[PDB]
Amino acid sequence: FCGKGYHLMSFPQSAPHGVVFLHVTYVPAQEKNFTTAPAICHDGKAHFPREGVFVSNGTHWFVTQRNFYEPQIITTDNTFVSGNCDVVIGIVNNTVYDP
Amino acid sequence: DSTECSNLLLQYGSFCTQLNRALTGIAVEQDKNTQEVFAQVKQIYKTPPIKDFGGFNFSQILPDPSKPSKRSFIEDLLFNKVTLFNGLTVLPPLLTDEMIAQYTSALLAGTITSGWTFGAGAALQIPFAMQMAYRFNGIGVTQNVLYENQKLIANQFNSAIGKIQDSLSSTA
Amino acid sequence: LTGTGVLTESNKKFLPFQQFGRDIADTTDAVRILDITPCSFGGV
Amino acid sequence: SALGKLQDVVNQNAQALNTLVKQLSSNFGAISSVLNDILSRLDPPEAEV
Amino acid sequence: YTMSLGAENSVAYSNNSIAIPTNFTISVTTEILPVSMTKTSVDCTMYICG
Numbered sequence: 001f002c003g004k005g006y007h008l009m010s011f012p013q014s015a016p017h018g019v020v021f022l023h024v025t026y027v028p029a030q031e032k033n034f035t036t037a038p039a040i041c042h043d044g045k046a047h048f049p050r051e052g053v054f055v056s057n058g059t060h061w062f063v064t065q066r067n068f069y070e071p072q073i074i075t076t077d078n079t080f081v082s083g084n085c086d087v088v089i090g091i092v093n094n095t096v097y098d099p
Numbered sequence: 100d101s102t103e104c105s106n107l108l109l110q111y112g113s114f115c116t117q118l119n120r121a122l123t124g125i126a127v128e129q130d131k132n133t134q135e136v137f138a139q140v141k142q143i144y145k146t147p148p149i150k151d152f153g154g155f156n157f158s159q160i161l162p163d164p165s166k167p168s169k170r171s172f173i174e175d176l177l178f179n180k181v182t183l184f185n186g187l188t189v190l191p192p193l194l195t196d197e198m199i200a201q202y203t204s205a206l207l208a209g210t211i212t213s214g215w216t217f218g219a220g221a222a223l224q225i226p227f228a229m230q231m232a233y234r235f236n237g238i239g240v241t242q243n244v245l246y247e248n249q250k251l252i253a254n255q256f257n258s259a260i261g262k263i264q265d266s267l268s269s270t271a
Numbered sequence: 272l273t274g275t276g277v278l279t280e281s282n283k284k285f286l287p288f289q290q291f292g293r294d295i296a297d298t299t300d301a302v303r304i305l306d307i308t309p310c311s312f313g314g315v
Numbered sequence: 316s317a318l319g320k321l322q323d324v325v326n327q328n329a330q331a332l333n334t335l336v337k338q339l340s341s342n343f344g345a346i347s348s349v350l351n352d353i354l355s356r357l358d359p360p361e362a363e364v
Numbered sequence: 365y366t367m368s369l370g371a372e373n374s375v376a377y378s379n380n381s382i383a384i385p386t387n388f389t390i391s392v393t394t395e396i397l398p399v400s401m402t403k404t405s406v407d408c409t410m411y412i413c414g
Protein backbone atom coordinates (compact mmCIF):
# COMPACT_ATOMS: atom_id res chain seq x y z
CA PHE A 1 0.00 0.00 0.00
CA CYS A 2 2.83 2.40 0.88
CA GLY A 3 5.62 1.02 -1.30
CA LYS A 4 7.27 -2.33 -1.93
CA GLY A 5 8.89 -3.65 1.24
CA TYR A 6 8.08 -3.26 4.91
CA HIS A 7 6.73 0.29 5.16
CA LEU A 8 8.69 2.51 7.55
CA MET A 9 7.33 5.99 6.79
CA SER A 10 6.36 8.37 4.01
CA PHE A 11 6.72 12.05 3.13
CA PRO A 12 4.24 14.07 1.04
CA GLN A 13 5.23 16.53 -1.66
CA SER A 14 2.98 18.71 -3.78
CA ALA A 15 2.78 18.67 -7.56
CA PRO A 16 0.87 20.71 -10.18
CA HIS A 17 -2.36 18.71 -9.91
CA GLY A 18 -1.47 15.91 -7.52
CA VAL A 19 0.71 14.57 -4.75
CA VAL A 20 3.96 12.60 -4.63
CA PHE A 21 4.61 10.25 -1.72
CA LEU A 22 8.22 9.39 -0.93
CA HIS A 23 7.81 6.00 0.72
CA VAL A 24 10.71 4.90 2.93
CA THR A 25 10.59 1.13 3.36
CA TYR A 26 12.79 -1.60 4.81
CA VAL A 27 13.92 -4.31 2.37
CA PRO A 28 15.90 -7.30 3.72
CA ALA A 29 19.04 -8.38 1.89
CA GLN A 30 22.12 -10.61 2.16
CA GLU A 31 20.23 -13.86 2.68
CA LYS A 32 21.67 -16.94 4.33
CA ASN A 33 20.42 -20.51 4.71
CA PHE A 34 19.91 -22.30 8.02
CA THR A 35 18.33 -25.51 9.27
CA THR A 36 15.19 -25.00 11.35
CA ALA A 37 13.13 -26.98 13.83
CA PRO A 38 9.52 -26.25 14.85
CA ALA A 39 10.33 -26.96 18.50
CA ILE A 40 13.02 -28.38 20.78
CA CYS A 41 12.84 -31.51 22.94
CA HIS A 42 14.27 -30.83 26.40
CA ASP A 43 13.53 -32.90 29.50
CA GLY A 44 10.81 -34.62 27.48
CA LYS A 45 9.00 -31.33 26.78
CA ALA A 46 8.53 -29.33 23.58
CA HIS A 47 9.83 -25.76 23.52
CA PHE A 48 8.66 -23.19 20.97
CA PRO A 49 10.05 -19.69 20.33
CA ARG A 50 8.30 -16.89 22.16
CA GLU A 51 9.08 -14.65 19.19
CA GLY A 52 11.52 -15.86 16.56
CA VAL A 53 12.70 -19.05 14.90
CA PHE A 54 15.06 -21.84 15.85
CA VAL A 55 18.03 -22.00 13.47
CA SER A 56 21.31 -23.88 13.38
CA ASN A 57 24.41 -22.77 11.51
CA GLY A 58 26.08 -26.16 11.33
CA THR A 59 26.01 -27.73 14.79
CA HIS A 60 24.58 -25.28 17.33
CA TRP A 61 20.98 -24.16 17.82
CA PHE A 62 20.04 -20.51 18.37
CA VAL A 63 16.74 -18.62 18.46
CA THR A 64 16.80 -15.59 16.17
CA GLN A 65 14.30 -12.98 15.07
CA ARG A 66 12.44 -13.65 11.85
CA ASN A 67 13.42 -10.59 9.79
CA PHE A 68 17.08 -10.20 10.82
CA TYR A 69 19.78 -12.74 11.65
CA GLU A 70 20.53 -12.01 15.32
CA PRO A 71 21.18 -15.45 16.83
CA GLN A 72 20.91 -15.99 20.57
CA ILE A 73 21.43 -18.95 22.87
CA ILE A 74 18.18 -20.81 23.49
CA THR A 75 16.89 -20.06 26.98
CA THR A 76 13.77 -20.58 29.05
CA ASP A 77 13.22 -16.81 28.81
CA ASN A 78 12.89 -16.70 25.00
CA THR A 79 10.99 -20.00 24.66
CA PHE A 80 7.77 -21.42 26.07
CA VAL A 81 7.04 -25.08 26.79
CA SER A 82 3.86 -26.90 25.73
CA GLY A 83 3.52 -30.58 26.58
CA ASN A 84 5.71 -33.47 25.52
CA CYS A 85 7.30 -33.70 22.07
CA ASP A 86 5.77 -36.96 20.85
CA VAL A 87 3.18 -35.03 18.82
CA VAL A 88 5.17 -32.27 17.07
CA ILE A 89 6.19 -33.36 13.57
CA GLY A 90 9.86 -32.60 13.04
CA ILE A 91 11.03 -31.63 16.53
CA VAL A 92 14.78 -31.62 17.18
CA ASN A 93 16.82 -32.51 20.26
CA ASN A 94 18.84 -29.80 22.01
CA THR A 95 19.53 -28.26 25.41
CA VAL A 96 17.60 -25.24 26.70
CA TYR A 97 19.74 -23.04 28.92
CA ASP A 98 18.29 -22.23 32.35
CA PRO A 99 19.54 -18.80 33.59
CA ASP B 100 -18.86 1.96 -48.21
CA SER B 101 -20.98 4.98 -49.19
CA THR B 102 -19.16 7.97 -50.67
CA GLU B 103 -22.17 10.27 -50.31
CA CYS B 104 -22.61 9.37 -46.64
CA SER B 105 -18.88 9.76 -46.00
CA ASN B 106 -18.93 13.23 -47.57
CA LEU B 107 -21.97 14.15 -45.46
CA LEU B 108 -20.17 12.94 -42.33
CA LEU B 109 -17.01 14.93 -43.11
CA GLN B 110 -18.88 18.22 -42.70
CA TYR B 111 -20.47 17.04 -39.43
CA GLY B 112 -17.35 17.56 -37.31
CA SER B 113 -14.89 15.26 -35.57
CA PHE B 114 -17.07 12.97 -33.46
CA CYS B 115 -15.50 9.88 -35.02
CA THR B 116 -12.05 10.77 -33.69
CA GLN B 117 -13.48 11.40 -30.22
CA LEU B 118 -15.28 8.04 -30.17
CA ASN B 119 -12.21 6.17 -31.42
CA ARG B 120 -10.05 7.92 -28.81
CA ALA B 121 -12.46 6.97 -26.03
CA LEU B 122 -12.54 3.33 -27.12
CA THR B 123 -8.74 3.22 -27.39
CA GLY B 124 -8.44 4.62 -23.88
CA ILE B 125 -10.85 1.97 -22.63
CA ALA B 126 -8.80 -0.82 -24.22
CA VAL B 127 -5.52 0.58 -22.88
CA GLU B 128 -6.90 0.80 -19.35
CA GLN B 129 -8.22 -2.77 -19.60
CA ASP B 130 -4.71 -3.96 -20.41
CA LYS B 131 -3.43 -1.82 -17.53
CA ASN B 132 -5.99 -3.39 -15.18
CA THR B 133 -4.89 -6.91 -16.05
CA GLN B 134 -1.21 -5.97 -15.74
CA GLU B 135 -1.68 -4.27 -12.36
CA VAL B 136 -3.73 -7.15 -10.95
CA PHE B 137 -1.58 -10.07 -12.09
CA ALA B 138 1.96 -8.67 -12.49
CA GLN B 139 2.68 -8.00 -8.81
CA VAL B 140 5.89 -10.07 -8.94
CA LYS B 141 8.44 -9.85 -11.76
CA GLN B 142 10.08 -13.21 -10.98
CA ILE B 143 8.42 -16.46 -12.10
CA TYR B 144 8.95 -18.69 -9.08
CA LYS B 145 8.74 -22.44 -9.69
CA THR B 146 7.28 -24.93 -7.24
CA PRO B 147 9.81 -27.63 -6.29
CA PRO B 148 9.52 -31.17 -7.67
CA ILE B 149 9.21 -32.72 -4.20
CA LYS B 150 5.92 -31.55 -2.68
CA ASP B 151 6.22 -32.02 1.09
CA PHE B 152 4.17 -29.18 2.59
CA GLY B 153 3.45 -30.73 5.98
CA GLY B 154 0.44 -32.68 4.72
CA PHE B 155 -1.21 -29.87 2.76
CA ASN B 156 -2.18 -30.82 -0.80
CA PHE B 157 -2.06 -28.02 -3.38
CA SER B 158 -2.17 -30.31 -6.43
CA GLN B 159 -5.69 -29.02 -7.09
CA ILE B 160 -4.40 -25.44 -7.44
CA LEU B 161 -0.85 -25.93 -8.73
CA PRO B 162 -0.33 -26.22 -12.50
CA ASP B 163 -0.68 -29.71 -13.95
CA PRO B 164 2.11 -30.75 -16.37
CA SER B 165 -0.58 -32.29 -18.61
CA LYS B 166 -0.55 -28.95 -20.48
CA PRO B 167 -4.25 -28.00 -20.61
CA SER B 168 -2.86 -24.51 -21.20
CA LYS B 169 -0.79 -25.43 -18.12
CA ARG B 170 -3.69 -24.35 -15.90
CA SER B 171 -4.52 -25.88 -12.54
CA PHE B 172 -7.53 -28.14 -12.14
CA ILE B 173 -9.67 -25.41 -10.58
CA GLU B 174 -8.49 -22.98 -13.25
CA ASP B 175 -9.66 -25.39 -15.96
CA LEU B 176 -12.99 -25.80 -14.17
CA LEU B 177 -13.42 -22.01 -14.04
CA PHE B 178 -12.48 -21.58 -17.70
CA ASN B 179 -14.92 -24.29 -18.80
CA LYS B 180 -17.71 -22.84 -16.61
CA VAL B 181 -18.00 -19.51 -18.50
CA THR B 182 -19.81 -19.59 -21.84
CA LEU B 183 -18.55 -16.79 -24.09
CA PHE B 184 -18.88 -6.86 -40.24
CA ASN B 185 -19.93 -3.22 -39.64
CA GLY B 186 -16.56 -1.91 -38.50
CA LEU B 187 -16.85 -3.57 -35.08
CA THR B 188 -13.52 -5.17 -34.16
CA VAL B 189 -12.52 -7.07 -31.02
CA LEU B 190 -8.89 -6.55 -30.08
CA PRO B 191 -6.91 -9.35 -28.39
CA PRO B 192 -5.67 -8.77 -24.84
CA LEU B 193 -2.01 -7.98 -24.32
CA LEU B 194 -1.57 -10.86 -21.85
CA THR B 195 -2.72 -14.27 -23.05
CA ASP B 196 -4.43 -16.79 -20.80
CA GLU B 197 -1.20 -18.81 -20.75
CA MET B 198 0.80 -15.84 -19.46
CA ILE B 199 -1.87 -15.03 -16.86
CA ALA B 200 -1.74 -18.66 -15.73
CA GLN B 201 2.04 -18.38 -15.49
CA TYR B 202 1.67 -15.29 -13.30
CA THR B 203 -0.82 -17.04 -11.01
CA SER B 204 1.41 -20.12 -10.77
CA ALA B 205 4.36 -17.91 -9.84
CA LEU B 206 2.27 -16.25 -7.13
CA LEU B 207 1.15 -19.64 -5.81
CA ALA B 208 4.70 -21.00 -5.76
CA GLY B 209 5.99 -17.92 -3.97
CA THR B 210 3.18 -18.07 -1.41
CA ILE B 211 3.60 -21.77 -0.62
CA THR B 212 7.42 -21.71 -0.65
CA SER B 213 8.32 -18.43 1.07
CA GLY B 214 5.17 -16.93 2.60
CA TRP B 215 4.89 -13.15 2.50
CA THR B 216 8.67 -12.66 2.29
CA PHE B 217 8.60 -12.68 -1.52
CA GLY B 218 6.41 -9.57 -1.63
CA ALA B 219 8.78 -7.46 0.48
CA GLY B 220 11.92 -8.35 -1.49
CA ALA B 221 13.67 -11.61 -2.33
CA ALA B 222 11.79 -14.82 -1.59
CA LEU B 223 12.94 -16.56 1.59
CA GLN B 224 12.21 -20.28 1.73
CA ILE B 225 10.49 -21.58 4.86
CA PRO B 226 8.78 -24.90 5.67
CA PHE B 227 5.05 -24.63 5.09
CA ALA B 228 4.31 -25.87 8.60
CA MET B 229 6.39 -23.02 10.02
CA GLN B 230 4.71 -20.54 7.68
CA MET B 231 1.31 -21.67 8.93
CA ALA B 232 2.62 -21.33 12.48
CA TYR B 233 3.57 -17.74 11.61
CA ARG B 234 0.05 -17.10 10.36
CA PHE B 235 -1.60 -18.73 13.38
CA ASN B 236 0.53 -16.50 15.60
CA GLY B 237 -0.62 -13.63 13.41
CA ILE B 238 -4.31 -14.27 14.05
CA GLY B 239 -3.55 -14.43 17.77
CA VAL B 240 -3.28 -18.21 18.23
CA THR B 241 0.01 -19.59 19.54
CA GLN B 242 2.19 -21.88 17.44
CA ASN B 243 1.77 -24.97 19.62
CA VAL B 244 -1.88 -25.08 18.53
CA LEU B 245 -0.79 -25.68 14.94
CA TYR B 246 2.14 -27.95 15.75
CA GLU B 247 -0.17 -30.14 17.84
CA ASN B 248 -3.10 -30.03 15.38
CA GLN B 249 -1.01 -30.18 12.21
CA LYS B 250 -2.59 -33.36 10.83
CA LEU B 251 -6.13 -32.21 11.64
CA ILE B 252 -5.54 -28.80 10.06
CA ALA B 253 -4.02 -30.34 6.93
CA ASN B 254 -6.98 -32.71 6.60
CA GLN B 255 -9.45 -29.85 7.05
CA PHE B 256 -7.66 -27.78 4.40
CA ASN B 257 -7.65 -30.68 1.94
CA SER B 258 -11.35 -31.32 2.59
CA ALA B 259 -12.13 -27.63 2.04
CA ILE B 260 -10.25 -27.64 -1.27
CA GLY B 261 -12.16 -30.75 -2.33
CA LYS B 262 -15.45 -29.11 -1.40
CA ILE B 263 -14.56 -26.06 -3.48
CA GLN B 264 -13.74 -28.40 -6.36
CA ASP B 265 -17.14 -30.09 -6.06
CA SER B 266 -19.02 -26.79 -5.74
CA LEU B 267 -17.40 -25.38 -8.87
CA SER B 268 -17.89 -28.66 -10.74
CA SER B 269 -21.55 -29.46 -10.05
CA THR B 270 -23.17 -26.44 -8.39
CA ALA B 271 -23.84 -23.63 -10.87
CA LEU C 272 -16.80 40.31 -42.97
CA THR C 273 -19.02 41.34 -40.06
CA GLY C 274 -17.87 41.24 -36.46
CA THR C 275 -17.66 42.96 -33.10
CA GLY C 276 -14.48 43.74 -31.21
CA VAL C 277 -11.58 46.11 -30.65
CA LEU C 278 -9.22 47.04 -33.49
CA THR C 279 -5.57 47.56 -32.55
CA GLU C 280 -2.29 48.13 -34.35
CA SER C 281 -0.67 44.78 -35.11
CA ASN C 282 2.98 43.76 -34.92
CA LYS C 283 2.28 40.74 -37.14
CA LYS C 284 3.63 40.80 -40.70
CA PHE C 285 1.11 40.22 -43.49
CA LEU C 286 2.66 39.39 -46.84
CA PRO C 287 1.25 41.43 -49.74
CA PHE C 288 -1.05 38.58 -50.82
CA GLN C 289 -2.63 38.07 -47.37
CA GLN C 290 -5.91 39.71 -46.33
CA PHE C 291 -7.27 37.94 -43.23
CA GLY C 292 -5.34 36.35 -40.38
CA ARG C 293 -6.64 33.43 -38.31
CA ASP C 294 -5.36 31.97 -35.05
CA ILE C 295 -6.25 28.53 -33.72
CA ALA C 296 -9.95 27.60 -33.99
CA ASP C 297 -10.11 29.27 -37.45
CA THR C 298 -11.60 32.46 -35.97
CA THR C 299 -10.53 35.69 -37.64
CA ASP C 300 -7.89 37.47 -35.56
CA ALA C 301 -6.53 40.20 -37.85
CA VAL C 302 -7.85 42.00 -40.93
CA ARG C 303 -6.23 44.27 -43.50
CA ILE C 304 -3.40 45.47 -40.73
CA LEU C 305 -5.45 45.51 -37.52
CA ASP C 306 -5.63 42.93 -34.75
CA ILE C 307 -9.12 42.04 -33.51
CA THR C 308 -9.67 41.47 -29.79
CA PRO C 309 -13.06 40.50 -28.29
CA CYS C 310 -14.60 43.20 -26.13
CA SER C 311 -13.87 42.61 -22.45
CA PHE C 312 -16.22 39.97 -21.05
CA GLY C 313 -16.39 37.42 -18.28
CA GLY C 314 -18.50 35.88 -15.57
CA VAL C 315 -20.37 37.70 -12.80
CA SER D 316 8.36 11.13 -17.95
CA ALA D 317 8.49 10.60 -14.18
CA LEU D 318 5.20 12.51 -13.78
CA GLY D 319 3.42 10.63 -16.54
CA LYS D 320 0.11 10.35 -14.68
CA LEU D 321 -0.21 14.08 -13.98
CA GLN D 322 0.96 14.97 -17.48
CA ASP D 323 -1.60 12.55 -18.92
CA VAL D 324 -4.42 14.14 -16.92
CA VAL D 325 -3.37 17.58 -18.15
CA ASN D 326 -3.14 16.31 -21.73
CA GLN D 327 -6.61 14.75 -21.60
CA ASN D 328 -8.17 17.95 -20.28
CA ALA D 329 -6.38 20.13 -22.83
CA GLN D 330 -7.21 17.79 -25.72
CA ALA D 331 -10.90 17.68 -24.79
CA LEU D 332 -11.02 21.48 -24.59
CA ASN D 333 -9.22 21.82 -27.94
CA THR D 334 -11.60 19.30 -29.51
CA LEU D 335 -14.54 21.40 -28.31
CA VAL D 336 -12.99 24.57 -29.72
CA LYS D 337 -12.36 22.87 -33.06
CA GLN D 338 -15.93 21.54 -33.12
CA LEU D 339 -17.02 25.17 -32.77
CA SER D 340 -16.03 25.56 -36.44
CA SER D 341 -18.15 22.87 -38.13
CA ASN D 342 -21.05 23.38 -40.53
CA PHE D 343 -23.24 20.49 -39.32
CA GLY D 344 -25.07 20.85 -42.64
CA ALA D 345 -25.48 24.64 -42.63
CA ILE D 346 -24.36 26.95 -45.43
CA SER D 347 -21.45 28.16 -43.29
CA SER D 348 -20.08 27.70 -39.79
CA VAL D 349 -20.01 31.46 -39.11
CA LEU D 350 -23.16 32.73 -37.41
CA ASN D 351 -22.38 36.31 -38.45
CA ASP D 352 -22.10 35.19 -42.08
CA ILE D 353 -25.44 33.37 -41.93
CA LEU D 354 -27.13 36.39 -40.36
CA SER D 355 -25.61 38.82 -42.87
CA ARG D 356 -26.41 36.58 -45.86
CA LEU D 357 -29.94 35.38 -45.05
CA ASP D 358 -33.32 36.73 -43.98
CA PRO D 359 -35.22 35.55 -40.91
CA PRO D 360 -36.81 32.25 -42.02
CA GLU D 361 -33.86 30.42 -43.56
CA ALA D 362 -31.55 32.29 -41.20
CA GLU D 363 -33.24 30.54 -38.28
CA VAL D 364 -33.39 27.16 -40.01
CA TYR E 365 9.16 -10.93 -29.82
CA THR E 366 7.07 -12.60 -27.11
CA MET E 367 7.27 -10.59 -23.90
CA SER E 368 8.94 -12.27 -20.94
CA LEU E 369 7.12 -12.27 -17.61
CA GLY E 370 10.40 -12.17 -15.69
CA ALA E 371 13.41 -14.16 -14.64
CA GLU E 372 12.41 -17.73 -13.79
CA ASN E 373 14.02 -18.90 -10.54
CA SER E 374 13.11 -21.90 -8.41
CA VAL E 375 13.17 -21.35 -4.65
CA ALA E 376 15.34 -23.86 -2.78
CA TYR E 377 12.48 -25.28 -0.75
CA SER E 378 13.07 -27.94 1.88
CA ASN E 379 11.03 -29.08 4.86
CA ASN E 380 13.88 -28.22 7.27
CA SER E 381 15.55 -25.21 5.63
CA ILE E 382 14.94 -21.48 6.11
CA ALA E 383 16.54 -18.36 4.65
CA ILE E 384 17.10 -15.40 6.97
CA PRO E 385 18.40 -11.97 5.88
CA THR E 386 21.56 -10.67 7.53
CA ASN E 387 21.46 -7.09 6.21
CA PHE E 388 18.83 -4.56 5.14
CA THR E 389 18.27 -1.65 2.77
CA ILE E 390 16.33 1.58 3.24
CA SER E 391 14.54 1.98 -0.09
CA VAL E 392 12.88 5.29 -0.95
CA THR E 393 10.34 5.09 -3.78
CA THR E 394 7.96 7.64 -5.29
CA GLU E 395 4.22 7.23 -5.85
CA ILE E 396 2.49 9.92 -7.91
CA LEU E 397 -1.27 10.36 -7.55
CA PRO E 398 -3.43 12.92 -9.37
CA VAL E 399 -5.66 14.91 -7.02
CA SER E 400 -7.41 17.57 -9.14
CA MET E 401 -8.09 18.75 -12.67
CA THR E 402 -8.41 22.19 -14.22
CA LYS E 403 -11.66 23.91 -13.21
CA THR E 404 -13.23 24.86 -16.54
CA SER E 405 -16.51 26.70 -17.01
CA VAL E 406 -18.37 27.28 -20.27
CA ASP E 407 -20.87 30.02 -21.09
CA CYS E 408 -23.28 27.88 -23.09
CA THR E 409 -25.15 30.78 -24.67
CA MET E 410 -21.97 32.52 -25.85
CA TYR E 411 -20.36 29.29 -27.06
CA ILE E 412 -23.40 28.26 -29.09
CA CYS E 413 -24.25 31.77 -30.36
CA GLY E 414 -21.43 34.19 -29.58
Ligand SMILES: *[C@@H]1O[C@H](CO)[C@@H](O)[C@H](O)[C@H]1NC(C)=O
Nearest residue numbers: 031032033223224375376383
Ligand atom coordinates in the same frame (compact mmCIF):
# COMPACT_ATOMS: atom_id res chain seq x y z
C1 LIG F 1 21.19 -21.97 0.03
O1 LIG F 1 20.05 -21.25 -0.43
C2 LIG F 1 20.11 -20.94 -1.84
C3 LIG F 1 18.89 -20.10 -2.15
O2 LIG F 1 18.57 -19.23 -1.07
C4 LIG F 1 20.17 -22.23 -2.65
O3 LIG F 1 20.32 -21.90 -4.03
C5 LIG F 1 21.33 -23.10 -2.19
O4 LIG F 1 21.28 -24.36 -2.85
C6 LIG F 1 21.27 -23.31 -0.69
N1 LIG F 1 22.42 -24.07 -0.23
C7 LIG F 1 22.58 -25.38 -0.48
C8 LIG F 1 23.83 -26.01 0.07
O5 LIG F 1 21.75 -26.03 -1.11
Ligand SMILES: *[C@@H]1O[C@H](CO)[C@@H](O)[C@H](O)[C@H]1NC(C)=O
Nearest residue numbers: 056057058059060061062071
Ligand atom coordinates in the same frame (compact mmCIF):
# COMPACT_ATOMS: atom_id res chain seq x y z
C1 LIG G 1 28.14 -22.15 14.71
O1 LIG G 1 28.13 -21.12 15.71
C2 LIG G 1 28.83 -21.46 16.91
C3 LIG G 1 28.65 -20.30 17.87
O2 LIG G 1 28.52 -19.07 17.17
C4 LIG G 1 30.30 -21.73 16.59
O3 LIG G 1 30.97 -22.13 17.78
C5 LIG G 1 30.41 -22.82 15.54
O4 LIG G 1 31.77 -23.00 15.16
C6 LIG G 1 29.58 -22.46 14.31
N1 LIG G 1 29.64 -23.52 13.32
C7 LIG G 1 29.73 -23.30 12.01
C8 LIG G 1 29.78 -24.51 11.14
O5 LIG G 1 29.78 -22.16 11.55
Ligand SMILES: *[C@@H]1O[C@H](CO)[C@@H](O)[C@H](O)[C@H]1NC(C)=O
Nearest residue numbers: 089090091149151378379380
Ligand atom coordinates in the same frame (compact mmCIF):
# COMPACT_ATOMS: atom_id res chain seq x y z
C1 LIG H 1 11.87 -33.81 5.83
O1 LIG H 1 11.81 -34.71 4.72
C2 LIG H 1 12.80 -35.75 4.79
C3 LIG H 1 12.69 -36.53 3.50
O2 LIG H 1 12.92 -35.70 2.37
C4 LIG H 1 12.55 -36.61 6.03
O3 LIG H 1 13.57 -37.59 6.12
C5 LIG H 1 12.55 -35.73 7.28
O4 LIG H 1 12.19 -36.51 8.41
C6 LIG H 1 11.58 -34.57 7.12
N1 LIG H 1 11.64 -33.69 8.27
C7 LIG H 1 10.62 -32.94 8.67
C8 LIG H 1 10.86 -32.07 9.87
O5 LIG H 1 9.53 -32.95 8.09
Ligand SMILES: *[C@@H]1O[C@H](CO)[C@@H](O)[C@H](O)[C@H]1NC(C)=O
Nearest residue numbers: 041042043044091092093094
Ligand atom coordinates in the same frame (compact mmCIF):
# COMPACT_ATOMS: atom_id res chain seq x y z
C1 LIG I 1 15.99 -37.17 21.61
O1 LIG I 1 16.32 -37.74 22.88
C2 LIG I 1 15.43 -38.79 23.29
C3 LIG I 1 15.86 -39.19 24.68
O2 LIG I 1 16.68 -38.20 25.28
C4 LIG I 1 15.49 -39.94 22.29
O3 LIG I 1 14.55 -40.94 22.68
C5 LIG I 1 15.16 -39.43 20.89
O4 LIG I 1 15.34 -40.47 19.95
C6 LIG I 1 16.06 -38.25 20.53
N1 LIG I 1 15.70 -37.71 19.23
C7 LIG I 1 16.35 -38.03 18.10
C8 LIG I 1 15.84 -37.38 16.85
O5 LIG I 1 17.30 -38.80 18.09
Ligand SMILES: *[C@@H]1O[C@H](CO)[C@@H](O)[C@H](O)[C@H]1NC(C)=O
Nearest residue numbers: 029030385386387388389390
Ligand atom coordinates in the same frame (compact mmCIF):
# COMPACT_ATOMS: atom_id res chain seq x y z
C1 LIG J 1 25.37 -4.23 5.16
O1 LIG J 1 25.54 -3.48 3.95
C2 LIG J 1 26.37 -2.32 4.09
C3 LIG J 1 26.35 -1.61 2.75
O2 LIG J 1 25.05 -1.62 2.18
C4 LIG J 1 27.76 -2.73 4.53
O3 LIG J 1 28.57 -1.57 4.73
C5 LIG J 1 27.68 -3.54 5.82
O4 LIG J 1 28.97 -4.02 6.18
C6 LIG J 1 26.73 -4.71 5.65
N1 LIG J 1 26.60 -5.45 6.90
C7 LIG J 1 26.66 -6.78 6.98
C8 LIG J 1 26.50 -7.37 8.35
O5 LIG J 1 26.83 -7.48 5.99
